[PDB]
Ligand binder design. Structure first.
Ligand SMILES: CCCCCCCCCCCCCCCCCC(=O)OC[C@H](COP(=O)(O)OCCN)OC(=O)CCCCCCCCCCCCCCCCC
Ligand SMILES: [Ca+2]
Lengths: 48, 50, 49, 49, 49, 100
């Protein structure tokens, strides 16, 4: 399985780097109630 | 309750007039467990009960 | 000297950064317990009285 | 009352309701749909709990 | 010969049954039974040493 | 801040001593001690024998939060002392058990 290990390892690395550049630091803004430091979200929703 | 957006959380039992005639005055002493196991959700609850 | 406003304790500190705008916290329930030696200027000849 | 972020000071009012789980074991056609989903490994821990 | 291979085996089995009855308590608490287990740990050790 | 072990013996010795000051100004009426805790493995039978052999003091034990610690000893303490037992798992449960 050595030859497949190499492949999978290099796949993750490549995608990891592409991911890096592509969306590095683009996920730091969320909706907030005005003035407060609380996150605004519906019921069964995850902060996004 | 819901016709404005402020909602009353008034309980008769809680009231001071109700309490003085409920019972006799008292020397209490709140004893709290602060061992490691309490830390967590439970520790949070105790500070609000006392 | 006694007044309708509740008797206050401490310097009031509320954090504006952590009050979400529409939830309605409790207002007050304390009794208005002003003392005679706090409604008037204290003497030693008034603590006797 | 419900408490946002478990804050004994920040609560909203909600009506009470008797709810039924979407996947149950009431009859044999229900328990079975439940088992198919537990067999696809999708959401089986919820059912388990 | 025959049972020293088995005595030691059951010893390595009882220690397993012991690592598992243990109860992890937070912030450093501890039930009186975990203490009993630590005490038994020394025996287990001297048998493997 | 919570850390360390749990000794239900130094907690009720300190409580009884506090209850017996009699130098200070006091209510001198109902004498009661209430403990907030989650689970207890020790009933502390010895402290209650002497400090309150005749049951002058009343003990109320509160078990709080969602947890697996044993509640039998705490219930026993409450029963022994003519107090009561109250659970509190939740914030909405605080308001009717701390007045009850
Ligand atoms: C035989 C294979 C079936 C696998 C088991 C599926 C069982 C699911 C089932 O029994 O559905 C009944 C479902 C129960 O309803 P309930 O959860 O009580 O909710 C209230 C509904 N008003 O209420 C329903 O109406 C579900 C009925 C739909 C049944 C599913 C249709 C199956 C079609 C499969 C076709 C593909 C077959 C090809 C196979 C290729 C390789 C295997
Ligand atoms: Ca404990």
């Amino acid at each position: 399985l050595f030859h497949i290990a190499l492949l999978v390892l290099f796949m993750v690395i490549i995608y990891a780097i592409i991911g890096l550049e592509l969306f590095k630091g683009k996920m730091h803004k969320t909706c907030y109630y005005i003035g407060t430091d609380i996150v605004a979200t519906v019921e069964n929703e995850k902060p996004s | 309750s819901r016709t404005p957006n402020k909602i009353d959380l008034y309980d008769v039992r809680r009231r001071p007039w109700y309490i003085q005639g409920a019972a006799s005055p008292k020397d209490m002493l709140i004893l709290v467990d602060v061992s490691g196991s309490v830390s967590g959700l439970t520790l949070k609850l105790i500070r609000t009960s006392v | 000297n006694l007044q309708p406003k509740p008797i206050g304790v401490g310097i009031p500190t509320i954090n504006l950064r952590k009050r979400r705008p529409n939830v309605q916290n409790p207002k007050s329930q304390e009794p208005v317990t002003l003392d005679f030696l706090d409604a008037e200027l204290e003497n030693d000849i008034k603590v006797e009285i | 009352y419900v408490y946002k972020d478990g804050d004994p000071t920040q609560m909203e009012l909600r009506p009470r309701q008797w709810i039924h789980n979407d996947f149950h074991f009431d009859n044999v056609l229900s328990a079975m749909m439940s088992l198919f989903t537990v067999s696809t490994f999708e959401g089986w821990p919820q059912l388990l709990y | 010969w025959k049972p020293f291979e088995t005595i030691i085996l059951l010893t390595i089995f009882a220690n397993c049954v012991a690592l598992a009855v243990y109860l992890p308590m937070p912030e450093d608490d501890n039930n009186s039974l975990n203490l009993g287990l630590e005490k038994l740990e020394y025996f287990f050790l001297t048998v493997f040493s | 801040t919570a850390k360390g072990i749990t000794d239900y013996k130094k907690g009720f010795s300190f409580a009884f001593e506090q209850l017996l000051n009699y130098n200070v100004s006091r209510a001198n009426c109902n004498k009661i001690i209430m403990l907030f805790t989650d689970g207890g493995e020790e009933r502390a039978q010895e402290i209650f024998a002497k400090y309150n052999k005749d049951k002058k003091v009343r003990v109320f034990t509160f078990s709080v939060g969602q947890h697996n610690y044993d509640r039998g000893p705490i219930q026993w303490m409450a029963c022994e002392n003519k107090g009561y037992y109250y659970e509190i798992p939740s914030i909405g449960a605080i308001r009717i058990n701390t007045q009850e």
